[PDB]
Amino acid sequence: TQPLSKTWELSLYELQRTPQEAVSPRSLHSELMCPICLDMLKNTMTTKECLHRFCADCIITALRSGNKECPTCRKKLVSKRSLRPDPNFDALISKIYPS
């Protein structure tokens, strides 16, 4: 949407910012949901272009086929390289919902 040089330009506040020093799972429904199966994400795979997340099995089934686009925002998915596993998101999910 905006030029790159605008998107990542830091404000005067941001050029001097200092760290921010370090409830119910029910309210996180939308954030942890797979847009395809509508269930909580498993084996999360994330698109490099748009950072949209899907269950591994879900996005693989979708891509084949397909149209080779992100199911959420329609952006092109040029290749197999366009997706990558997101183990850190799985671990966050696991801490939110322990087994």
């Binding site: 790159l4 830091l10 506040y13």
Partner: protein, 95 residues
């Protein structure tokens, strides 16, 4: 316990909560926007895993992680407001 989520919601660079979380797409590692943008001003390597970004302008490979920001705001109630207050204090002192 909010403390238990720290590893998955803090910045590897500044060690604080992720603020405007921003992801290096090639290796999917996430940092504060300011932290990673400023790091990239004189490096092409992911600060966490050392993977080198292949573009001349490393900013091309950054994406804001809006989903993660929303999760963090719900896991750390008050954070959204504390950072807005922090910014307000800066501008009030300089304006």
């Amino acid at each position: 316990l909010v403390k238990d989520f720290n590893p998955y919601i803090t910045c590897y660079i500044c060690k604080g909560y992720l603020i405007k979380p921003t992801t290096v797409t090639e290796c999917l590692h996430t940092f504060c926007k300011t932290c990673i943008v400023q790091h990239f001003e004189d490096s092409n390597d992911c600060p966490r895993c050392g993977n080198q970004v292949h573009e001349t302008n490393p900013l091309e490979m950054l994406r804001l992680d809006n989903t993660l920001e929303e999760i963090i705001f719900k896991l750390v109630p008050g954070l959204r407001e504390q950072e807005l207050e922090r910014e307000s204090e800066f501008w009030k002192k300089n304006k």
